[PDB]
Design an enzyme around this catalytic site. Structure first.
Site, mmCIF file in Angstrom:
data_model
loop_
_atom_site.group_PDB
_atom_site.id
_atom_site.type_symbol
_atom_site.label_atom_id
_atom_site.label_comp_id
_atom_site.label_asym_id
_atom_site.label_seq_id
_atom_site.Cartn_x
_atom_site.Cartn_y
_atom_site.Cartn_z
ATOM 1 N N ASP A 23 -2.186 15.674 -6.174
ATOM 2 C CA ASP A 23 -2.928 15.132 -7.294
ATOM 3 C C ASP A 23 -2.001 14.650 -8.395
ATOM 4 O O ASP A 23 -0.771 14.764 -8.263
ATOM 5 C CB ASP A 23 -3.906 16.239 -7.810
ATOM 6 C CG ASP A 23 -3.274 17.610 -8.103
ATOM 7 O OD1 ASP A 23 -2.151 17.668 -8.587
ATOM 8 O OD2 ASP A 23 -3.908 18.635 -7.815
ATOM 9 N N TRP B 32 -11.426 3.822 -0.078
ATOM 10 C CA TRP B 32 -12.845 3.742 0.179
ATOM 11 C C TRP B 32 -13.553 4.001 -1.130
ATOM 12 O O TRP B 32 -14.203 5.024 -1.345
ATOM 13 C CB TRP B 32 -13.195 4.779 1.248
ATOM 14 C CG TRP B 32 -12.671 4.500 2.656
ATOM 15 C CD1 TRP B 32 -12.152 3.289 3.058
ATOM 16 C CD2 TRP B 32 -12.694 5.415 3.693
ATOM 17 N NE1 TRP B 32 -11.862 3.447 4.325
ATOM 18 C CE2 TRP B 32 -12.172 4.688 4.736
ATOM 19 C CE3 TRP B 32 -13.070 6.731 3.883
ATOM 20 C CZ2 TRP B 32 -12.022 5.253 5.984
ATOM 21 C CZ3 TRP B 32 -12.912 7.297 5.132
ATOM 22 C CH2 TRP B 32 -12.395 6.566 6.172
ATOM 23 N N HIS C 121 -13.406 -4.567 -0.840
ATOM 24 C CA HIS C 121 -14.479 -3.843 -0.126
ATOM 25 C C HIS C 121 -14.781 -2.539 -0.847
ATOM 26 O O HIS C 121 -13.960 -2.127 -1.702
ATOM 27 C CB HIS C 121 -14.058 -3.488 1.333
ATOM 28 C CG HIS C 121 -12.724 -2.740 1.428
ATOM 29 N ND1 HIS C 121 -11.520 -3.205 1.773
ATOM 30 C CD2 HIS C 121 -12.536 -1.432 1.048
ATOM 31 C CE1 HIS C 121 -10.626 -2.260 1.589
ATOM 32 N NE2 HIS C 121 -11.259 -1.206 1.161
ATOM 33 N N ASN D 226 -16.389 -8.688 7.561
ATOM 34 C CA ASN D 226 -15.925 -7.339 7.308
ATOM 35 C C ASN D 226 -14.635 -6.977 8.028
ATOM 36 O O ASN D 226 -14.399 -7.337 9.191
ATOM 37 C CB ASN D 226 -16.971 -6.287 7.731
ATOM 38 C CG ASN D 226 -18.275 -6.364 6.963
ATOM 39 O OD1 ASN D 226 -18.400 -6.955 5.885
ATOM 40 N ND2 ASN D 226 -19.340 -5.800 7.502
ATOM 41 N N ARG E 177 -0.807 -3.162 -7.278
ATOM 42 C CA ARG E 177 -0.557 -3.570 -5.917
ATOM 43 C C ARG E 177 -1.965 -3.827 -5.365
ATOM 44 O O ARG E 177 -2.796 -2.899 -5.238
ATOM 45 C CB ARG E 177 0.144 -2.469 -5.116
ATOM 46 C CG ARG E 177 0.647 -2.952 -3.735
ATOM 47 C CD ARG E 177 -0.344 -3.219 -2.613
ATOM 48 N NE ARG E 177 -0.969 -1.980 -2.209
ATOM 49 C CZ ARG E 177 -1.589 -1.822 -1.031
ATOM 50 N NH1 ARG E 177 -1.712 -2.813 -0.145
ATOM 51 N NH2 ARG E 177 -2.118 -0.639 -0.733
ATOM 52 N N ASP F 263 -4.566 -4.636 -2.547
ATOM 53 C CA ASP F 263 -4.813 -4.477 -1.133
ATOM 54 C C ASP F 263 -5.512 -5.689 -0.512
ATOM 55 O O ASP F 263 -6.416 -6.248 -1.147
ATOM 56 C CB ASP F 263 -5.645 -3.197 -0.964
ATOM 57 C CG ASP F 263 -6.112 -2.912 0.464
ATOM 58 O OD1 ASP F 263 -5.256 -2.644 1.319
ATOM 59 O OD2 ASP F 263 -7.328 -2.997 0.726
ATOM 60 N N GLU G 270 -0.560 -7.251 -0.587
ATOM 61 C CA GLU G 270 -0.205 -6.970 0.787
ATOM 62 C C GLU G 270 -0.813 -8.028 1.697
ATOM 63 O O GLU G 270 -2.033 -8.108 1.770
ATOM 64 C CB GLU G 270 -0.734 -5.609 1.215
ATOM 65 C CG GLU G 270 -0.210 -5.354 2.625
ATOM 66 C CD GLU G 270 -0.518 -4.008 3.243
ATOM 67 O OE1 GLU G 270 -0.704 -2.997 2.562
ATOM 68 O OE2 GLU G 270 -0.697 -3.972 4.444
ATOM 69 N N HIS H 136 3.263 2.655 4.502
ATOM 70 C CA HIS H 136 2.019 3.117 5.089
ATOM 71 C C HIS H 136 1.532 2.351 6.304
ATOM 72 O O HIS H 136 0.652 2.864 6.995
ATOM 73 C CB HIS H 136 0.954 3.107 3.976
ATOM 74 C CG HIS H 136 0.781 1.746 3.324
ATOM 75 N ND1 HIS H 136 1.616 1.040 2.556
ATOM 76 C CD2 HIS H 136 -0.298 0.938 3.575
ATOM 77 C CE1 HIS H 136 1.101 -0.160 2.362
ATOM 78 N NE2 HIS H 136 -0.043 -0.197 2.976
ATOM 79 N N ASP H 137 2.025 1.157 6.643
ATOM 80 C CA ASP H 137 1.500 0.386 7.766
ATOM 81 C C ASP H 137 2.390 0.386 8.985
ATOM 82 O O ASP H 137 2.144 -0.414 9.886
ATOM 83 C CB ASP H 137 1.344 -1.084 7.496
ATOM 84 C CG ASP H 137 0.416 -1.460 6.389
ATOM 85 O OD1 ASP H 137 -0.709 -0.937 6.338
ATOM 86 O OD2 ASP H 137 0.899 -2.284 5.593
ATOM 87 N N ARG I 156 2.032 9.557 7.188
ATOM 88 C CA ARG I 156 1.557 9.935 5.867
ATOM 89 C C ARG I 156 1.544 11.455 5.776
ATOM 90 O O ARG I 156 0.564 12.067 5.318
ATOM 91 C CB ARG I 156 0.119 9.430 5.618
ATOM 92 C CG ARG I 156 -0.056 7.971 5.233
ATOM 93 C CD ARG I 156 -0.423 7.011 6.386
ATOM 94 N NE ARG I 156 -1.782 6.624 6.217
ATOM 95 C CZ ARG I 156 -2.255 5.384 6.095
ATOM 96 N NH1 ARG I 156 -1.624 4.247 6.370
ATOM 97 N NH2 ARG I 156 -3.558 5.337 5.855
HETATM 98 CA CA LIG Z 1 -5.347 19.403 -6.154
#
Ligand SMILES: [Ca+2]
Ligand SMILES: [Ca+2]
Length: 684
Positions: A53, A101, A140, A193, A227, A229, A257, A327-328, A375
């Site tokens: 966090d 998300w 999205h 989508n 950045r 997405d 990206e 990450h990719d 990750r």
């Molecule tokens: Ca935490």
């Protein structure tokens, strides 16, 4: 403030960014952790929340982990509220731990912290000279099934708690209902989508407004960069219009990206970096670096060829963000890859052009192939690795030596396994020698550089077996570059004449403030030129030796070179600054009945610089689309165009060299004062 200050939100060329998945770094506050099936205290199921966090990031800024590593910016997961529901994808539970998300872009994700925690992250970071970059994903909301509202949260969007709408029964048309992309064309990937993610319809004026308002809130909280997405999956025209509202409000460094799988030029990717108003993650630099240092599928000539070609394609190659992994893709470290090859790829990225980013845990040699294994939880906060030591010695050079932050790159010596290159800006010079061969040393003879006569110590202090050298007016005495060595030699001095190193942003309307960074501007306010126009006085809001902030003059929209004159000496020109006609809105142009021949495309131009001022060349708009929102022989395209202005335009067909224009009089349309619009006409 100098170019180098934490205050410089418009340029990250002097920075080293540390990219972190907030969830996977440090759980600084267990009380905000998710409960139940969504959480995993051990973090061995990498699809669930591990609990990291913003308090965890505050702790490591406070105990100097980042300051000792030498990074000067943190790029963190999207900070906004994500869906709470868990999603079962064929037996495995998936959570929103990654931040992608979203369900409310105006609230924080409570598992990372409260708004007050966010503000405390910004303050603590800035007090230590560390900039904060946030992910922002306007393409999205979240996974949705139109036929099943019980799946996940049906991609619902909230506006600070008030429901705006979900994917099922979207009577307002907030989202696209075109099925999922098969990625067969650019068009197909924009208006369908991505997998099951509910795709925003940014032509809907509520959605346009929502995202201009949502990003303003985060900029008002002090974020220093963005950045974006999935920039390949949203219309360039809408993104340019959204970028112009950010720059008119609080300009910050923005990059996107657009994935590429090799080092080859991609025309659509080059155009986006040159025309959108934002720069890109440099996947071409990344492929060449992995091919040479990691996978041994290319040799040093592919590295040099990528340096020359990217410097050619991108108008501002120094704005592209470089990296050895992220990450990719699979983590750079694998059991087949030795530590020295990763240390070398780090040394090369940190001294090369662009804005370098390090994926969290690289300094600990973290492994992990594919998503989500790449990750993994941050395994240690050891400050002892060679990788750690390499980054803390080289990252400060981007702040102290302007050749690294702003310089050109020139090849000085090369063969299959050795590369020696030079960075130069004014009188500052940095020379880097790399021998990727792990077993044999290389005898280097006849190296010439721009280093003044003198002897140079390796900035790395021999931690990667580098050696010291002697220059006699640039000629370097013969030396042996050891097996697996990399050495960095530099010379900095004060600049006496004005030389521009960066201008940020490079797009704006009259009245916006842009930041010119460089050397030798002096303390006395001089004049800035946009083309022929001199800007002086009060229009220049601040002027010091390394940084000028100036208001964009009210001149005709078009492409300009910026030049500074201090004490009657004119600087180098910084090319390709875009001045816009004014505030931007996005208009969808639709033209019916435009039949074409095989290989003939449709383009649009008109009477403002945003439409190309009647040109049929690369400033004209297009090629237009004709498959998803409207189908051939109707064509359409979404364009950023000045607000509240009467425009004249015509479409034209172009197959090679031959142009065929519409007949008759120009079409006319007056644009809205804000938001979006659609104008439909018939081919004449
Ligand atoms: Ca935490
Ligand atoms: Ca899209």
């Amino acid at each position: 403030d100098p170019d180098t200050a934490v205050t410089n939100k418009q340029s990250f060329s002097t920075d080293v960014i540390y990219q972190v998945f907030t969830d996977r770094f440090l759980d600084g506050n267990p009380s905000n952790n998710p409960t139940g099936a969504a959480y995993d205290a051990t973090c061995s199921n990498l699809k669930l929340y591990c609990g990291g966090d913003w308090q965890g990031l505050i702790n490591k800024i406070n105990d100097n982990y980042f300051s000792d590593l030498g990074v000067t910016a943190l790029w963190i997961s999207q900070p906004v509220e994500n869906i709470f529901a868990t999603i079962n994808y064929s037996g495995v539970t998936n959570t929103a731990y990654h931040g992608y998300w979203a369900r409310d872009f105006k609230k924080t994700n409570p598992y990372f912290g409260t708004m007050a925690d966010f503000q405390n992250l910004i303050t603590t970071a800035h007090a230590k000279g560390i900039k904060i970059v946030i992910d922002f994903a306007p393409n999205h909301t979240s996974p949705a099934m139109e036929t099943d509202t019980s799946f996940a949260e049906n991609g619902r969007l909230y506006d600070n708690g008030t429901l705006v709408g979900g994917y099922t029964n979207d009577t307002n048309g907030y989202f696209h209902h075109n099925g999922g992309s098969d990625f067969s064309s650019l068009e197909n990937g924009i208006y369908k989508n991505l997998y099951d993610l509910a795709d925003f319809n940014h032509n809907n004026a509520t959605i346009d407004k929502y995202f201009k308002d949502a990003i303003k809130l985060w900029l008002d909280m002090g974020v220093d960069g963005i950045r974006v997405d999935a920039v390949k999956h949203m219309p360039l025209g809408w993104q340019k219009s959204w970028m112009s509202s950010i720059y008119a409000h609080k300009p910050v460094f923005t990059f996107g990206e657009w994935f590429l799988g090799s080092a080859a030029s991609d025309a659509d990717n080059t155009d986006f970096a040159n025309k959108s108003g934002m720069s890109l993650l440099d996947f071409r630099f990344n492929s060449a670096v992995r091919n040479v240092f990691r996978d041994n599928t290319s040799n040093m000539y592919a590295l040099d060829s990528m340096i020359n070609s990217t410097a050619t394609d991108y108008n501002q190659v120094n704005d592209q963000v470089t990296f050895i992994d992220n990450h990719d893709m699979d983590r750079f470290k694998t059991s087949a890859v030795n530590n020295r090859r990763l240390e070398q790829a780090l040394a090369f990225t940190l001294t090369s052009r662009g804005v370098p980013a390090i994926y969290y845990g690289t300094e600990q040699y973290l492994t992990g192939n594919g998503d989500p294994d790449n990750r993994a939880k941050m395994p240690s906060f050891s400050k002892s690795t060679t990788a750690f030591n390499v980054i803390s010695k080289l990252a400060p050079l981007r702040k102290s030596n302007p050749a690294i932050a702003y310089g050109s790159t020139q090849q000085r010596w090369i063969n299959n396994d050795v590369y020696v290159y030079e960075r130069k800006f004014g009188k500052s010079v940095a020379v880097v020698a790399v021998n990727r061969n792990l077993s044999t040393s290389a005898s280097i003879t006849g190296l010439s550089t721009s280093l003044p006569t003198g002897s140079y110590t390796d900035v790395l202090g021999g931690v990667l077996n580098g050696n010291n050298i002697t220059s006699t007016n640039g000629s370097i005495n013969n030396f042996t570059l050891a097996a697996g060595a990399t050495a960095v030699w530099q010379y900095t001095t004060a600049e006496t004449t004005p030389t521009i190193g960066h201008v940020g942003p490079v797009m704006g309307k009259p009245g916006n403030v842009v930041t010119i960074d460089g050397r030798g501007f002096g303390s006395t306010k001089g004049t800035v030129y946009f083309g022929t126009t001199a800007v002086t006085g009060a229009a220049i809001t601040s002027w010091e030796d390394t940084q000028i902030k100036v208001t964009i003059p009210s001149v005709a929209a078009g492409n300009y070179a910026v030049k500074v004159a201090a004490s009657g000496v004119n600087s180098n020109a910084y090319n390709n600054f875009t001045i816009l006609t004014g505030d931007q809105v996005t208009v969808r142009f639709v033209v019916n009945n435009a039949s074409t021949t095989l290989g003939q495309n449709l383009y649009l131009t008109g009477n403002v610089a945003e439409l190309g001022n009647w040109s049929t060349g690369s400033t004209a708009i297009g090629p237009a689309f004709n498959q998803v929102i409207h189908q051939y022989p109707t064509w359409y395209y979404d364009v950023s165009v000045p607000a509240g202005k009467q425009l004249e335009f015509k479409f034209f067909k172009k197959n090679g060299s031959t142009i065929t224009w519409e007949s008759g009089s120009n079409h006319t349309f007056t644009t809205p004062a804000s938001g979006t619009a659609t104008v439909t006409v018939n081919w004449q």
